[PDB]
Design a protein around this nucleic acid. Structure first.
Ligand SMILES: CC1=C(/C=C/C(C)=C\C=C\C(C)=C\C(=O)O)C(C)(C)CCC1
Ligand SMILES: CC1=C(/C=C/C(C)=C\C=C\C(C)=C\C(=O)O)C(C)(C)CCC1
Ligand SMILES: [Zn+2]
Ligand SMILES: [Zn+2]
Ligand SMILES: [Zn+2]
Ligand SMILES: [Zn+2]
Lengths: 278, 308, 9, 10
DNA sequence: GCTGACCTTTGACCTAG
DNA sequence: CTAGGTCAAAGGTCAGC
């Protein structure tokens, strides 16, 4: 049981002769596209090919024909670097919203998409975007969060105005999980790129391209999890699993802001006031 | 002759004269619930020299000549896959195995609530919740767990299981859903039975499940993943819940891409339907407390005990 | 929560 | 209004 | 861009009822 | 005589140099 072409190990007969996988692929590609030979030196097309034909390989046995480069993690790396009680968090939300508008223009194909499409995609999942932002920004501190204005918010002070259950939802279902699994900035920008390219948004003009960009984000993030963490088998799936909790938190989160708006007590910045008023 | 590829026959297989290659192709396709995608016009003619080229064309020609789908009768991580397939198929009969029937109670245009369909729908809901806990038991390692944490996971995922299961019973041509006893309701009767504002979105979810082409195995695994989730509040042993759900995720991926070679992007989509399921069940949970006052009697025991 | 307990055990 | 629309305007 | 180790799919042959 | 099952030998992919 030895290759009759270069003496390599063989599992069986191919094209009529005992051979290895190297001689197999070489012969197949040579037929499709039209000197001592051992495993040490099998890589002269004559000898190699001539020895394959000499040992009895049949050309008629060949049958007929049967980190990415359009959404590379390269641009997400560049993005997260490029940009990065109740009234203070609304403050930081308004400060961050400008930088979110800026963070849109750094995703490879976000600029080429249409005029309405930009505004719809951006003000459709802005709250989940910024919630992901400071949720990933709050990995260091334990039971609190860090805003975009250097403000620490936590414990009963964060729990003071009947807004502690949602704070603990963010701390338990997002912050502590991101810390426990050590999510990279790249993976963060990929998740926020998926939240960004939401094809189920209303009034979208030709949302198929949005969903396609979301496909390329899926594939590029997945291949990135293949290269960066090959030891971790389930890295892409369980980081995707973070999005359901993000939407669930963002819902009650946004409704809190809704009642807060329609009671007129909290001074809400105008740019923030827009996204709440569709 | 072979009616598919014009080759030497080996007998009448699955209803027509066929060769051994097409026989094995059809058996492998039906047994493993394969999904093929053609890279051309799906016109690719199949014969003696042009075989394969496109698997969807070959299977399509098998169904055009009249092969009977009815006649048809790594491993470490696939074991639990087959186990959950058994559990979900024995705790929820699939739509194409129910002799379904209809009713005519408030079937034209919508009303606020129909008491009778709320009654029949209530006993049906209690039944399906029982079988939901039965599906939970037969999951690998769910029994050997903290009782308070099992109650936590079931309390948190019961509505998601209900919406997913009832949305795997949808008929697009009639815009109808069918329950576990054959009771088939249209959108109007679903609204009148006690769905209300949920209806429109729930049915929406149903249509969003149609392009995914999920089978019973993928639905069972997704159900288990919604059940076994380490993000539920008030968990006493959440890390072991997450560890218990990891192999379900990996097995779901291996299975999904096992049934779809040309669509290696369906695992993130089928997994991301959970993102919508969260909001749907999140509004349904309070839809129950809106149904609290509209019923003259009271809420059935298991429904209120599992939904609050 | 009687139903859950009786069902589990 | 068009605050975001004008923020992406330039 | 070719290479080749590693995986999946096909089909001629087989056994049972 | 036709199911389902088997496994050598075709096909394919895609880091790594
Ligand atoms: C979740 C959270 C709130 C919503 C914040 C929103 C909608 C965006 C935050 C942006 C920030 C604050 C970014 C940053 O830190 O860089 C509210 C007000 C409901 C109260 C509790 C904390
Ligand atoms: C429990 C129930 C509700 C939802 C049921 C859903 C979403 C599916 C039921 C599926 C059944 C009951 C299938 C079967 O018959 O097997 C809602 C939120 C309307 C509130 C009233 C009680
Ligand atoms: Zn060789
Ligand atoms: Zn030479
Ligand atoms: Zn044939
Ligand atoms: Zn084709």
């Amino acid at each position: 049981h030895i290759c009759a072409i270069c003496g390599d190990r063989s599992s069986g007969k191919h094209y009529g002769v005992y051979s290895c996988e190297g001689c197999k692929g070489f012969f197949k590609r040579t037929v499709r596209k039209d000197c001592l030979i051992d495993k040490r030196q099998r890589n002269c097309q004559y000898c190699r090919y001539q020895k394959c034909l000499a040992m009895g390989m049949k050309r008629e046995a060949v049958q007929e024909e049967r980190a990415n480069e359009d959404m590379p993690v390269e641009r997400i790396l560049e993005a997260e670097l490029a940009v990065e009680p109740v009234t203070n968090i609304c403050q930081a939300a308004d400060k961050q919203l400008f930088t979110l508008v800026e963070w849109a223009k750094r995703i490879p194909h976000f600029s080429e998409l249409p005029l309405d499409d930009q505004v719809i995609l951006l003000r459709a999942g802005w709250n989940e975007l910024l919630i992901a932002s400071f949720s990933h920004r709050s990995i260091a501190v334990k039971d609190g969060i860090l805003l975009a204005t250097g403000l620490h918010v936590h414990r009963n002070s964060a729990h003071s105005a009947g807004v502690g259950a949602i704070f603990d939802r963010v701390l338990t279902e997002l912050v502590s999980k991101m810390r426990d699994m050590q999510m990279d900035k790249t993976e963060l920008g990929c998740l926020r790129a998926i939240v960004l390219f939401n094809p189920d948004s209303k009034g979208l003009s030709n949302p198929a391209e949005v969903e396609a960009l979301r496909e390329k984000v899926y594939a590029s993030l997945e291949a990135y999890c293949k290269h960066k963490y090959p030891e971790q088998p389930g890295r892409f799936a369980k980081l995707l699993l973070r999005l359901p909790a993000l939407r669930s938190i963002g819902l009650k989160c946004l409704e809190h802001l809704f009642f807060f708006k329609l009671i007129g007590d909290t001074p809400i910045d105008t740019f923030l006031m827009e996204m709440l008023e569709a | 002759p072979c009616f598919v590829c014009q080759d030497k026959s080996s007998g009448y297989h699955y209803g027509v004269s066929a060769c051994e290659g097409c026989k094995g192709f059809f058996r492998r396709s039906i047994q493993k619930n394969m999904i093929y995608t053609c890279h051309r016009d799906k016109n690719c003619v199949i014969n003696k020299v042009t075989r394969n080229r496109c698997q969807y064309c070959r299977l399509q020609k098998c169904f055009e000549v009249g092969m009977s789908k009815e006649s048809v009768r790594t491993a470490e991580l696939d074991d639990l896959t087959e186990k959950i397939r058994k559990a979900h198929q024995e705790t929820f009969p699939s739509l194409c195995q129910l002799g379904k029937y209809t009713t005519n109670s408030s079937a034209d245009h919508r009303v606020r609530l129909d008491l009778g369909l709320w009654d029949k729908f209530s006993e049906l809901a209690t039944k399906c919740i029982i079988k939901i806990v039965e599906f939970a038991k037969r999951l690998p390692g769910f029994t050997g767990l903290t009782i308070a944490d099992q109650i936590t996971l079931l309390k948190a995922a019961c509505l998601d299981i209900l919406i997913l299961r009832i949305c795997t019973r949808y008929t697009p041509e009639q815009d109808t859903m069918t329950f576990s006893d054959g009771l088939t309701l249209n959108r109007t009767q679903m609204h009148n039975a006690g769905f209300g504002p949920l209806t429109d979105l729930v049915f929406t979810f149903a249509n969003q499940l149609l392009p995914l082409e999920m089978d019973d195995t993928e639905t069972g695994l997704l159900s288990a993943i919604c059940l076994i989730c380490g993000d539920r509040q008030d968990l006493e042993e959440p890390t072991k819940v997450d560890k218990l759900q990891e192999p379900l995720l990996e097995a779901l991926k291996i299975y999904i891409r096992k049934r779809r070679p040309s669509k290696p992007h369906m695992f993130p989509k089928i997994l991301m339907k959970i993102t919508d399921l969260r909001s749907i069940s999140a509004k349904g949970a309070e839809r129950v407390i809106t149904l609290k006052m509209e019923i003259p009697g009271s809420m059935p025991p298991l429904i209120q005990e599992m939904l609050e | 929560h009687k139903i859950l307990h009786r069902l589990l055990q």
